[PDB]
Write a protein that binds this ligand. Structure first.
Ligand SMILES: CC[C@@H](OC(=O)N(Cc1ccccc1)C(=O)Nc1cc(OC)cc(OC)c1)c1cc(-c2ccc(OC(C)(C)C(=O)O)cc2)no1
Lengths: 271, 10
């Protein structure tokens, strides 16, 4: 079964992951694409493209806060709000991955610590087109130009994510494909400081086989889609590397700012 | 990793 899977076991795993993904993540790629192409009967997202539209739109986006800081800082605080919720979502999803909760609890923590931001940037692509990103569960649309234009170094958090996303979105994955791919990323046996790699690699083996079958079935025309996708896993680590360097700059150059305790915990002694 | 542990527990 989980030890020696045949096709039907792998399909069952794919479906289990798809169902828990639907349960864990409020906004799917399906719903996002419907929003981004106008093919839906909900009201359009509020478009945020400059300081004035941010001001006009802060009304319409789920963002809880105490209170006026500059625009770049306010966007960054927003990103912390969303990132914390995303980490919660991903943690709930990880618990649904067969075998994950049976791992040493310290290894569960290490896999999340390293995996969550990689998953955030992967799933961010689902909310993006080349001109901007859906925010606050599709209620808002923040333009790429606006985000790119934020004063240094805040703009540099943004544009690398878009650049990754347009290339990643060229693969045309759906939610059923992504549900397995994100599980694969979480179950990475090479994270620093793992205590017991073998049961993590056992789970990842099965996930990778499940992903490969899913891609062959769901994208029969898309030859070697499994292989291109695997190469994106190293790209995601580079996004993290660059991102952490910018956070380190911010920590020093912006004294009033401090990360949410969850995010401090994730970044503390990362690598 | 206090908060992550808490999230994993529930
Ligand atoms: C390039 C697209 C941009 O997207 C957004 O601005 N979002 C979507 C988003 C952000 C963070 C995680 C997942 C998705 C966004 O929600 N912006 C946003 C802006 C707001 O402006 C006031 C308000 C707001 O309220 C919920 C949200 C973005 C920003 C980032 C980003 C992510 C993390 C980050 O640093 C922190 C939060 C410390 C981290 O690493 O966890 C800094 C920037 N990743 O993508």
């Amino acid at each position: 079964d989980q030890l020696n899977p045949e096709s039907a076991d792998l399909r069952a795993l794919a479906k289990h992951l798809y169902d828990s993904y639907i349960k864990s993540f409020p906004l799917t790629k399906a719903k996002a694409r419907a929003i981004l192409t106008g093919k839906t009967t909900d009201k359009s997202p509020f478009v945020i493209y400059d300081m004035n539209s941010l001001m006009m739109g802060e009304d319409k986006i789920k963002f809880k806060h105490i209170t006026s800081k500059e625009v770049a800082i306010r966007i960054f605080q927003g990103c912390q709000f969303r990132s914390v919720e995303a980490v919660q979502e991903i943690t709930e999803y990880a618990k649904s991955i067969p075998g994950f909760v049976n791992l040493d609890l310290n290894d569960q923590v290490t896999l999340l610590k390293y995996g969550v931001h990689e998953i955030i940037y992967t799933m961010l692509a689902s909310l993006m087109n080349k001109d901007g990103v859906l925010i606050s569960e599709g209620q808002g649309f923040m333009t790429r130009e606006f985000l790119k234009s934020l004063r240094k170094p805040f703009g540099d958090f943004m544009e690398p994510k878009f650049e990754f996303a347009v290339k990643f979105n060229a693969l045309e994955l759906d939610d059923s494909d992504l549900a397995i791919f994100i599980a694969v990323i979480i179950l990475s046996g090479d994270r620093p400081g793992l205590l017991n790699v073998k049961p993590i690699e056992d789970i990842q083996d099965n996930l990778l086989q499940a992903l490969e079958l899913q891609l062959k079935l769901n994208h029969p025309e898309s030859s070697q889609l499994f292989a291109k996708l695997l190469q994106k896993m190293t790209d995601l680590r580079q996004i993290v590397t660059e991102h952490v360097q910018l956070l380190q700059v911010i920590k020093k150059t912006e004294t009033d700012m401090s990360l949410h305790p969850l995010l401090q915990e994730i970044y503390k002694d990362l690598y | 990793h206090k908060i992550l542990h808490r999230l994993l527990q529930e």
